[PDB]
């Protein structure tokens, strides 16, 4: 049944209805005290608000994301 | 039934071999960390039941041949033949058997029950030239060319094969009037098994 498919989001970016694999991230450093916002698969580095520190290490797909840290997905 | 499943487990039909065969994928539950492929087992049961039903649907039992060229399924198939009506072949299948009219050992059935379409492939092939349906107690890796029903099991492990055969026989008996339900069937596995 090509129409109502179930577990195949492990297809390529070219599914039945194309989605992106990327998503946005509510992110926080250990002790900057804020939602910083982020895009997974971000090319250019993002500097957090206060002390401008590397939050995302840039890379060939899905930014490495610095130190321990924590990220919620933005959802919706 | 859980009992059947338990029996299967005790034997080994849950393990299929390495090499998956894309058309068999659906029957396989998942692969293991080892490098083996575990068959879904409920599927094996249901399929087996279906096969049994089909067998029963044949009017007279004698014209439903069974086959295994393997040395250690041969015994099992003989037993099956004895218990139901069905011919066994056992061992050396002759290439003319279902086509060549004039041959001595001709005998053209209404169903063919192979144990393994890998090794007993000739028989399977023949089934095409005489419109014989073919059920197959096939492995994970096996080719399902010409086989109608594929019961997913394992063929490598002789004991497992024997068990499967026994189960099938039991099912057929149940379907027929001979051994009523609720009562377990008297004869054992080990009886079917090679040595």
């Amino acid at each position: 049944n090509p129409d109502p498919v179930e577990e195949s989001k492990k297809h390529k970016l070219k599914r039945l209805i194309p989605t992106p694999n990327s998503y946005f991230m509510d992110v926080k450093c250990p002790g900057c005290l804020q939602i910083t916002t982020l895009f997974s698969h971000a090319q250019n580095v993002v500097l957090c608000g206060s002390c401008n520190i590397m939050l995302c290490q840039p890379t060939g797909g899905k930014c490495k994301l610095t130190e321990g840290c924590s990220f919620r997905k933005k959802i919706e | 039934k859980e009992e059947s499943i338990a029996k299967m487990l005790i034997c080994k039909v849950h393990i299929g071999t390495k090499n998956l065969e894309n058309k068999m994928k659906r029957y396989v539950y998942t692969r293991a960390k080892d490098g083996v492929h575990i068959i879904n087992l409920a599927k094996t049961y249901e399929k087996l039941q279906l096969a049994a039903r089909i067998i029963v649907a044949i009017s007279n039992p004698a014209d439903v041949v069974v086959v295994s060229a393997r040395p250690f399924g041969s015994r099992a198939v003989l037993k099956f033949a004895q218990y139901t009506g069905a011919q066994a072949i056992a061992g050396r299948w002759t290439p003319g058997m279902l086509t060549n009219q004039i041959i001595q050992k001709f005998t053209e059935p209404r169903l063919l029950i192979v144990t393994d379409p890998r090794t007993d492939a000739q028989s399977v092939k023949e089934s095409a030239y005489a419109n014989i349906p073919v059920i197959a107690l096939c492995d994970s890796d096996s080719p399902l060319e010409h086989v109608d029903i594929a019961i997913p099991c394992n063929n490598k492990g002789k004991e497992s094969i024997a068990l499967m055969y026994w189960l099938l026989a039991q099912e057929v008996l149940y379907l027929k009037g001979v051994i009523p339900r609720s009562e377990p069937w008297n004869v054992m596995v080990d009886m079917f098994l090679w040595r």
Binding site: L13, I17, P20, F24, A42, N44, K74, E76 | -
Partner: protein, 149 residues
């Protein structure tokens, strides 16, 4: 691929929902302002978009602002005379030519230079057909270097 034998399909593909997502707080005006600032700072359209995506929380300027980013630049009046892609191509060509001048025996480079020239001429033609380029605009191997600025 237009010129190689390359046949890859690596691509951005946007999400089904094209009315902006709930979590996006930025009002349009602010984002427009930001875009303008970026443009002023020397960034090109694509680059600007990338910056917006990464540094600020915003996926697509098209979902927040009805308009696409080039359009808004145009509206604000900070649009380049010479379109992004075309400009880039020209730059590349210039670079190639310099190399050739330096280093005469490079055959592969020359071949690639020809290809880039051809592509420019296509792109250039297309722009002429619209009204982004003026009709009086050939691309010249002599001038080229001065053009980019």
């Amino acid at each position: 691929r237009m010129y190689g034998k390359g046949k890859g399909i690596s691509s951005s593909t946007l999400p089904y929902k094209r009315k902006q997502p709930s979590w996006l707080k930025q009002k349009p005006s602010e984002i427009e302002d930001a875009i303008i600032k970026l443009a002023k700072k020397g960034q090109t359209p694509s680059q600007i978009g990338a910056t917006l995506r990464d540094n600020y929380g915003i996926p697509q300027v098209k979902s927040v602002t009805g308009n696409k980013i080039l359009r808004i630049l145009r509206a604000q009046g900070i649009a380049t005379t010479i379109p992004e892609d075309l400009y880039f191509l020209i730059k590349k060509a210039v670079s190639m030519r310099k190399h050739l001048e330096k280093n005469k025996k490079d055959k592969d480079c020359k071949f690639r230079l020809i290809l880039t020239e051809s592509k420019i001429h296509r792109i250039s033609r297309y722009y002429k057909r619209k009204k982004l380029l003026p009709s009086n605009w050939k691309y010249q191997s002599s001038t080229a270097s001065a053009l980019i600025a």
